[PDB]
Symmetry: C6
Subunit: 91 residues, 6 copies
């Protein structure tokens, strides 16, 4: 249907919660895992991409699953243009 | 030469949110991200003074709904070449 | 494919203690360690669901006498290849 | 006049404050920017060099400007011998 | 006598305490220094190896000496099989 | 062989201040700096026992006026070669 493409984040304090978030996200929606990002202070960000509806569903599931394992610091969905979707991401 | 703009957050998600809003206009371009520990992440952009001021305002506005904003600042005219005043290894 | 098990501690000594107990059985194998700052260290193992459950239980049991356990979890069946779901640069 | 040569530091918590300190320092005095140093915990050190009078003037301006932007942790001027001025600095 | 071989840790907050621990450990027992490990947050782990009796004696001395210098976070001895003793250690 | 001296501070500026005072005498030489996170920086020097004792005292005295001193210690005679007892990657 070529709907809006989104970028999805679940940020946790602790890696185990982040791994669970990543697993739960690809388990629920048609999203693909972009990868992990570490910024120190135990903060780990899990990033996925896909349709906004799928990403919103994924990040909701990922956050929910991660909260049963550890601490979730941030959950957000960023709608993106169909080209250069991952351009905004850090190298 | 041209203006330098910074939005610094605690947490990466807020910083990515900030960067997304900052590069959303044509004449603003992303220099990159910087991590210094303690969860602090800085998003740096460059361009005309007006574009940068509007960018950093938009960046901070978007980021604060996601996480904590630690610093917002614009340097209208950097007194040294902007590649000297910036720390090395800025991951775009 | 096979199960994934995590024991996360604050402090390395507790994590090494955890890993020692986790690999103590034959059909459990160590993927490696992961450090993310704030003193947090994660020990990751893989194998059959039952072996991993027993491993993580043993790991957490041993580690808690040495330091603080921050997280214990088993993923029975990872929905993606376990090398994709794991962060890159896992030091064995 | 070949006066005493100094080493100047402004240490902040936060990068934005540090960048402002660096800009303000080279804007006020005849000092040149040696570079940045990161030690984690959000602590960033900006280092300049030049005459003691210039460096004292620079570090004062840099600290003052940085305090309007973020947190300043330390400000100091280290008088140095005319040779191996940057030898004391970390690699 | 081919007794049980052990792995020994002294974990400190601060490097100076860790260096003192390492020195005190090889000074007291027949243990050899494997090396240091840094995990951030000022936490440094000093690791030695040898007979359980020697390692127990070493880690006790190392911890005691380190406590006179700085903060000790953890002290532990891990008995190991005679082969792949350092296999359990991080790369 | 010869004595080992350490001054550990929170903050780099204090550590640089410490190092400046420590190398100020002829027969004291800087091994280098070490960062371990949490803002902790260690300055390490080597030389004769007396020179090192005077160096570390001077280093701590100078550093405490700039920042916090976390640790001061001298090892008169390292029981192992000083390159083994030191952590790897000491940036001079």
């Amino acid at each position: 249907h070529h709907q809006q493409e989104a970028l999805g984040m679940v940020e946790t304090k602790g890696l185990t919660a982040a791994i669970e978030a990543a697993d739960a996200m690809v388990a629920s929606a048609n999203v693909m895992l972009v990868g992990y990002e570490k910024i120190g202070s135990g903060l780990v960000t899990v990033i996925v991409r896909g349709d906004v509806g799928a990403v919103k569903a994924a990040t909701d599931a990922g956050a929910a699953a991660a909260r049963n394992v550890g601490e979730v610091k941030a959950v957000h969905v960023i709608p993106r243009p169909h080209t250069d979707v991952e351009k905004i991401l850090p190298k």
